[PDB]
Amino acid sequence: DLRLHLLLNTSVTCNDGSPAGYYLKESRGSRRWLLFLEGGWYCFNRENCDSRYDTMRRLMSSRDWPRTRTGTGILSSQPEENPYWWNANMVFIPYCSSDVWSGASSKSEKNEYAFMGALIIQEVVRELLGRGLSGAKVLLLAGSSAGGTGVLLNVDRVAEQLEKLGYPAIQVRGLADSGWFLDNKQYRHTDCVDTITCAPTEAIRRGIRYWNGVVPERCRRQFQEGEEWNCFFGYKVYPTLRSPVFVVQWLFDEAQLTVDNVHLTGQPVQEGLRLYIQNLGRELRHTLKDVPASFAPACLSHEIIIRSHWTDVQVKGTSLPRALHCWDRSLHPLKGCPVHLVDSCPWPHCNPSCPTGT
Numbered sequence: 443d444l445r446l447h448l449l450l451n452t453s454v455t456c457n458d459g460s461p462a463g464y465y466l467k468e469s470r471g472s473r474r475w476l477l478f479l480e481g482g483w484y485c486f487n488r489e490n491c492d493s494r495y496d497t498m499r500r501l502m503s504s505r506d507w508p509r510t511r512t513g514t515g516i517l518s519s520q521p522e523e524n525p526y527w528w529n530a531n532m533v534f535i536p537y538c539s540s541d542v543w544s545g546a547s548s549k550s551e552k553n554e555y556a557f558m559g560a561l562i563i564q565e566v567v568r569e570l571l572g573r574g575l576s577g578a579k580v581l582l583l584a585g586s587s588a589g590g591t592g593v594l595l596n597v598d599r600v601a602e603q604l605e606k607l608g609y610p611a612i613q614v615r616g617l618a619d620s621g622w623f624l625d626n627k628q629y630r631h632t633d634c635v636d637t638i639t640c641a642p643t644e645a646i647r648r649g650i651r652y653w654n655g656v657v658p659e660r661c662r663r664q665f666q667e668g669e670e671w672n673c674f675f676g677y678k679v680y681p682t683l684r685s686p687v688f689v690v691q692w693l694f695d696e697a698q699l700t701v702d703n704v705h706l707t708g709q710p711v712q713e714g715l716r717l718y719i720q721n722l723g724r725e726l727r728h729t730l731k732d733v734p735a736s737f738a739p740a741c742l743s744h745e746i747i748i749r750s751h752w753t754d755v756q757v758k759g760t761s762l763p764r765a766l767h768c769w770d771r772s773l774h775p776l777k778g779c780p781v782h783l784v785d786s787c788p789w790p791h792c793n794p795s796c797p798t799g800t
């Protein structure tokens with residue numbers, strides 16, 4: 443079990459002004475620290491944030507959080523379930539800022555909600571340094587879905603923070619799961635008039651302004667004022683990052699298909715949709731060709747790393763916990779211990795180890 447700590451700096455808050463926090467299980471014999479960012483969509487105006495507050499409140503408030511959580515998948519402390527990092531210090535950071543971990547704005551006379559995701563990560567790191575993170579050798583910032591995009595936006599800021607605080611020996615690394623999206627041509631098209639019709643590029647442009655969203659400086663300098671939305675797309679931000687980053691991405695991610703206005707239904711896939719899906723997998727493989735640490739199976743699914751059966755999927759006969767172990771060795775190519783694992787078959791579930799869904 444991981445135990446809840448609400449932040450001591452209570453000016454760093456969830457959307458409704460309640461304090462943010464983290465869940466910690468610590469491993470006193472270990473100098474490895476895993477900090478995991480939860481996902482779960484986002485909101486980008488008053489009306490869609492108000493609706494999220496009524497039916498997704500744990501993603502906007504700490505008032506009802508439980509005192510403990512059980513670690514699963516990569517957050518499990520049992521080697522049977524987590525062959526990779528079972529003995530590490532474990533931290534789960536709940537997503538309660540609705541801003542893809544980018545925001546830097548407080549609730550105030552002019553702001554009904556606070557969007558503090560970038561500040562929440564900084565404050566968790568600060569408070570952990572007094573609880574043993576000061577002695578760390580490796581800090582792995584991991585996350586799934588909106589949390590995986592959050593890793594790409596924040597990993598170099600955590601590295602800079604630790605340098606400026608006087609901890610240059612801590613090696614900061616990132617693990618981005620299900621957060622690598624394409625700003626591609628959609629299968630059907632609507633102009634952005636409400637939540638359901640707004641494509642991701644348009645919704646993120648509006649969100650950055652509503653949240654006071656921040657992006658990595660080297661990416662911001664390329665795209666410049668007004669164009670910061672580009673830095674939310676993995677293939678554009680990744681080449682600007684200096685910390686080592688391992689990318690996990692299903693080739694046919696269900697969230698990518700949803701934002702492309704594709705809905706698998708009743709089994710009748712005609713030629714136009716067949717070509718659309720095959721081209722999506724080819725484009726996503728193309729973006730990963732020069733990413734040396736990656737795991738990209740040909741499946742229709744969503745998230746991997748905190749699922750209890752995360753070890754089952756294999757690419758070319760190698761599981762994700764094995765590839766992450768090989769990545770660790772690479773940062774000390776390796777015979778029989780690969781780190782770049784991208785499927786080449788062209789259709790969902792052409793890999794027999796894909797999740798069934800049951």
Ligand SMILES: O=C(NCCc1ccncc1)NC1CCCCC1
Pocket residue numbers: 482483484542588591623642643646674675697700701
């Ligand atoms: O839109 C997303 N994820 C899907 C959010 C979602 C979830 C459930 N229904 C509808 C939408 N992430 C964005 C993509 C563009 C890059 C920055 C993150």
Ligand SMILES: *[C@@H]1O[C@H](CO)[C@@H](O)[C@H](O)[C@H]1NC(C)=O
Pocket residue numbers: 451453454561
């Ligand atoms: C609390 O966090 C805010 C926002 O990051 C920061 O400006 C402030 O200095 C912090 N308070 C203390 C006492 O460090």
